[PDB]
Amino acid sequence: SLNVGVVGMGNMGVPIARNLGFKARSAMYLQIHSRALSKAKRVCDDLSVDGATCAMRIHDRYSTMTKWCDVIVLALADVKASRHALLEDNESLIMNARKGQIIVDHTTVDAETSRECAHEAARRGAYFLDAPMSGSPRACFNGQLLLMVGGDAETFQKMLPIFHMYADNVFHMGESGSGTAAKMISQALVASHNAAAAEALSMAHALGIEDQSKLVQVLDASWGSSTMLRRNAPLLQDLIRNPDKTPPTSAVSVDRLLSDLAHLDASLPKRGGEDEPFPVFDAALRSLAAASDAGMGDRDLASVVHYIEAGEAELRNRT
Amino acid sequence: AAALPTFNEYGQRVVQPGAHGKEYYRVATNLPTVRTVDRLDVVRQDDEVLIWFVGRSFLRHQIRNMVSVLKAAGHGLWNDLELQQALQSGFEPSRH
């Protein structure tokens, strides 16, 4: 058997440890680490009161977690916290890694971070997998998450029954650094399809089509179909026909998308030779940035439709 | 070897007259092609190779063929087996 240890408790860190306590019927030993010992004791008490089938341990430092667990899984809040916990700390998980350990990072970090984490784990002898999470916290509670694991192939085959305890769709992107890029490409496509749907419904209102409930039925059966087109169109109808109406706040925000989009331009090569080798990506990014600073950053992703013309403001005047 | 007794496709014993004793113990050549090369040196000078042939009598285009054989050996194309088979092949009285 293998001992498993989950590091970090936030809004997304708790249900992974809850599912690892539920589905592991005292076969794989569970250890819990957090940024504070009070939060780890709190989540251990929460796992204890609702029915715990496996014994779980609480630790305040990473050294006991390293010397006790074979598999370490991390679910932190930001990139810099995972960089501090994995590499920058004195009792680091990768710098003091045991040969044969398997360290999986579920945070959306840059490509160079996953590259240097894989390099330090390969020099220490361990195996580092980067598998950024995509999904809802309640979908994580129900056990539905999207994971794009990059790392070794046989190490990925060793981690499939552990990954199937809290995620349905777990795919192998290839070598390390390819898993953290898939979330960047996915959210870039999300932003581009949202901008395209906003522009298409703006042109639909410009052409004078009054029935949008039948327009989405044909637009879903065409070649220009997308899931974001199915998602945003009932809200975009009210945001177009009532432009004075403020958009409602959502769980996913403009800043939540731009936080992952802020990792992509640092992980991409230098664009200054041609100044724009990505037209619709920056065309969506400027509209999201114009929607952020105007006071609509925390609201829904359908707020791009009021700032479509504002995406042209950084193109006419900067050139 | 081909003139020794062998069973044919129908199983009956056939034997060619080459492995008989008159053509079996037959010497290779009849013409005086047995020649002496006293000295055959390959000297690598600066920027060139010099093949020295010191011998009393030579055959027609013998030196110009030995130079071609030595050039083919310099590129690494033969072995001892092919050289011995070429030397025991003897004289070929046909231009084509």
């Binding site: 085959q157 499939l160 029954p161 199937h164 349905d168 769709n169 777990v170 | -």
Partner: protein, 124 residues
């Protein structure tokens, strides 16, 4: 996984979850890259679990590995020993039966000598 030539446990990574295992027919098992006997065993176990028979069978690997080491031609769970060319001690160089040293084996052991010394001390 009960058979040696049906490595069922080698293809845990060939399915994502329970429903994908239980919905795939033999053509989908063929395109996933599974050999014939293995995919036949997988499909038979799935169809037996669908009929109400869980996979409760004894693993016949070690028993067959025990029975393999003999020279049964049909693998019929028999025991056929190999007969070497020399099966008697006289033809392997040994001249006659070994005689035991009857004076060596009839000596009194060390505990018996110690108890005789203790008896000679305690009697007087």
């Amino acid at each position: 996984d009960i058979h040696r030539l049906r490595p069922t446990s080698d293809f845990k990574a060939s399915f994502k979850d329970w429903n994908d295992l239980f919905t795939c027919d033999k053509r989908q098992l063929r395109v996933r890259g599974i050999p014939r006997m293995t995919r036949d065993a997988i499909r038979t176990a799935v169809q037996a679990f669908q009929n109400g028979n869980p996979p409760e069978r004894f693993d016949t690997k070690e028993e067959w590995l025990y029975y393999k080491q003999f020279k049964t031609v049909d693998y019929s769970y028999r025991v056929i020993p190999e007969l070497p060319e020399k099966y008697r001690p006289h033809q392997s160089g040994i001249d006659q039966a070994p005689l035991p040293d009857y004076r060596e084996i009839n000596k009194m052991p060390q505990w018996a000598e110690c108890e005789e010394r203790r008896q000679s001390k305690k009697t007087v």
